[PDB]
Enzyme design. Structure first.
Site, PDB file in Angstrom:
ATOM      1  N   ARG A 224       5.779 -23.440  -4.105  1.00  0.00           N
ATOM      2  CA  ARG A 224       4.494 -23.326  -3.361  1.00  0.00           C
ATOM      3  C   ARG A 224       3.632 -22.209  -3.995  1.00  0.00           C
ATOM      4  O   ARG A 224       2.406 -22.267  -3.856  1.00  0.00           O
ATOM      5  CB  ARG A 224       4.751 -23.128  -1.857  1.00  0.00           C
TER       6      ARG A 224
ATOM      7  N   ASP B 239       8.364 -13.257  -4.186  1.00  0.00           N
ATOM      8  CA  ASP B 239       8.218 -14.522  -3.418  1.00  0.00           C
ATOM      9  C   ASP B 239       8.002 -15.715  -4.369  1.00  0.00           C
ATOM     10  O   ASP B 239       7.122 -16.583  -4.135  1.00  0.00           O
ATOM     11  CB  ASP B 239       7.186 -14.323  -2.305  1.00  0.00           C
TER      12      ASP B 239
END
Ligand SMILES: *CCC(=O)N[C@H]1CCOC[C@H]1Nc1ncc2cc(-c3c(Cl)c(OC)cc(OC)c3Cl)ccc2n1
Length: 268
Positions: free
Chosen positions: A152, A148
């Site tokens: 962010r 991932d």
């Protein structure tokens, strides 16, 4: 009742807890003598712990994350484990606290108005990408697949150092083999890095902008990719595109990304 790891146990009464940082809990805290070579010196740190609502299994997941962070070990460009509290009280996992939040927010907040020059120069932006590539090359060398990687999930220190987050334990970041075949490799992470590079040169842009989350798969299948963003040099766009080859074996390695970005920074 957990083992006492003498390499990691930190005194529970040297840890002064503070305000919550995120719920589900993670709490910021002052630690006294995290650096045993200045043992009265205090430092801000982040502390993960269980909420009272948590099952037998939720404890297992926090244990394994603590254990994987021990095993992966230290690097400048990841969020490092600093200590643990495992004894006579609730499980605390203590890690580095980064003052300037995630890399998406760091960049958005540093947008100039309209056409004006902003505080973030080409070299600072390439440096961001370089530091993320070095962090990923390190994690790859310790057999860690991120799964991932995105702006962010990179945090920024008071000194503007990039630190990969949430490597212990989002369709627009996922390699085709991860979308369709649920296959995650180092080369899957390289696809994501390409997307993160686009995010950097758009100062925290939302990828495939407009395009609905349901048309993407077909665009990728037809061989479409995001266009060069405004003011992004062709050298940097070509790295993004190399990251977005359909065949994983034709994407660069993190080692090659570290070298390419290194060459760009040397040329300044
Ligand atoms: C440091 C001052 C401060 O409060 N900073 C905040 C600024 C805005 O963003 C939230 C805060 N910063 C911050 N920094 C580091 C963090 C680390 C974790 C974290 C990560 Cl990334 C992790 O990765 C493997 C593991 C753990 O625990 C096992 C933790 Cl706690 C979470 C939040 C963070 N926030």
């Amino acid at each position: 009742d957990l083992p006492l790891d003498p390499l990691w146990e930190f005194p529970r009464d040297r840890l002064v807890l503070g305000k919550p940082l995120g719920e589900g809990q993670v709490v910021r805290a002052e630690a006294f003598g995290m650096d045993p070579a200045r043992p009265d010196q205090a430092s801000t740190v982040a502390v993960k712990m269980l909420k009272d609502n948590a099952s037998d299994k939720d404890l297992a997941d926090l244990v394994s994350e603590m254990e994987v962070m021990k095993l992966i070990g230290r690097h400048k460009n990841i969020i490092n484990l600093l200590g643990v509290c495992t004894q006579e009280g609730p499980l605390y996992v203590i890690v580095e606290c980064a003052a300037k939040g995630n890399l998406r927010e760091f960049l958005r907040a540093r947008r100039p108005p309209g056409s004006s020059e902003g505080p973030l120069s080409f070299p600072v932006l390439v440096s961001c990408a370089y530091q993320v590539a070095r962090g990923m090359q390190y994690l790859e060398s310790r057999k860690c697949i991120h799964r991932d990687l995105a702006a962010r999930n990179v945090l920024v220190t008071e000194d503007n150092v990039m630190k990969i987050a949430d490597f212990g334990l989002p369709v627009k970041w996922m390699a085709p083999e991860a979308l369709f075949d649920r296959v995650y490799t180092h080369q899957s992470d390289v696809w994501s890095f390409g997307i993160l590079l686009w995010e950097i040169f758009t100062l925290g842009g939302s990828p495939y902008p407009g395009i609905p989350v349901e048309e993407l798969f077909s665009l990728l299948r037809e061989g479409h990719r995001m266009d060069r963003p405004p003011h992004c040099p062709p050298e940097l766009y070509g790295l993004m595109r190399e990251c977005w080859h359909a065949a994983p074996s034709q994407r660069p390695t993190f080692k090659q990304l570290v070298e390419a970005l290194d060459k760009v920074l040397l040329a300044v």
